Amino acid sequence: FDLPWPLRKHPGVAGAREHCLGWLAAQGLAGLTAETFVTWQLDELAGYFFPRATQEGLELATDLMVWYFAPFDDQFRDPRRTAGVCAGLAEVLYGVPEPGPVASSPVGRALGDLWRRSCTGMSPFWRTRARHNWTGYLAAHTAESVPRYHGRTVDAAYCVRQRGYANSSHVIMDLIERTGGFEVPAMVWHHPVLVELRTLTSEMIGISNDLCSAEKEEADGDLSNNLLLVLENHEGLDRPEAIERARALTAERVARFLDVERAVTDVDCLLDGAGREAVRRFVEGLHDLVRGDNEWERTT
Amino acid sequence: FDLPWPLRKHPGVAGAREHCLGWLAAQGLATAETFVTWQLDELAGYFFPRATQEGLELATDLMVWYFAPFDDQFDGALGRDPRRTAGVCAGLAEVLYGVPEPGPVASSPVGRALGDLWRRSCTGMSPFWRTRARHNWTGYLAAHTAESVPRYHGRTVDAAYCVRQRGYANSSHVIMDLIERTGGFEVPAMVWHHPVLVELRTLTSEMIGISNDLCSAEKEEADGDLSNNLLLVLENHEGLDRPEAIERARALTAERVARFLDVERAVTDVDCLLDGAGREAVRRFVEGLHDLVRGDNEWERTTGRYQ
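YS: structure for the whole thing
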């Protein structure tokens, strides 16, 4: 998939990898969790995602990436159980004093470390919004664990929207600020222009995620919620046609992104110099998420 | 019009009006035409027909706060200054958070009344609801700021996009969090964010936003293509006259009613996620969405259109 933005990569990946291996050990997640870390190039992923982060920020993002792929994904199947695991993790984020088994397990305690560090230096506006976004992601992850289109009418745009709504980029997008040492003011963070840029970012990454994981989950057939399998079942396409449809949906969303991006100036009229710089760095960060995901999938 | 849901009414509207008159005076916000002419107490009764009396009174205070004091903040030529509207909304947002050095709107009557509404809203609600409801308050204040500056002047826009923007910015996003609080239950967070409930809330807010725009179109018509109101947008960007824009708004409402009825059938998709207490919470929440749409539709037909 072609993309119009330049690829950038953090030069501190090697230091972040060393930090992350020690952290996996400290957090009791270390067994081929480290092997999955290095061979899946999750330190490279973090370096593509946040190529302008502080070193501390890159290290936080690297820890979060390995947490997503090894201990979080390892927890996942039936809907009540996945709903309970996601609810227990959510409890970690709210500092619920009565910690269920999930919060006390390594994946839960590690999430607690990640969230404590994520909150460092961020205003209560950011903390509330990021907590809400984590909760929405965990709920949506539960929703996507059950077949949603078996014997139902659904168009490609609805499917893409669901996969974007469920995509982990919604959590990751909040870390552009945190890893870069700035914060978008809450009154402009919720501006509809920025909302739609975030929606598009998450949909393009969801399409990419689904494209690269379709062959693995092809066994699910019409019980899959993966966009490619859904297209094969609800548009009757074969796999090549499904790929070209995915490339088309991606291209449609790139064009929409450039168009909506033209209205970011609407946001600047309520901002001093620093707020304008924050918005610029945030929007550039969304470029890096899409382009970085693209490059990581390519090189992996 | 011709909605599939029944109109229901809380029995304690008279007590709620009396309470709210007392509340306005105590908060320094006293003005009675909000009830005498505009029937806000009756609207609250249609919105929350199954609340406790305490809950009905909280909803009444909130809706009256929105209608008179909050909206009063944006009256006259001054109320059109987008940097000032941004200032008021930012300072009201500040009321809700622990900020080191607050600005002057936090200690103004409108701001202190909002503090009282938020404290009462939190009573008995879990940290999940408190986080979510404050997030929704914050997004509402930000979206109100965004809607205070022309968004479509010299630009192309379609009806679906405009309706989505007015729904995103609608105060019904804050109001619907009060179904739980005024009713004494709570939707579990893992199902509150389920795509089915998300879409039902989006549809609800879009329908109420269409209805609200029907009532404010004559207020802003002098703004022409600088207005963000759905009807004026349809005039300037689809070339319709006013009766035509109203008919298009009726069609957009009908299509969202139909969609609502469709995805509402999928509310059973969250039963495999819940216990008995949860399924009941979801049921009462979805029914409360009916009451908001139906009550607003009634009030628009009889009163809101008069502006």
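YS: worth flagging: Residues 273-298 of chain A form the longest helix (26 residues).
IM: good catch. Also The radius of gyration of chain A is 19 Å.
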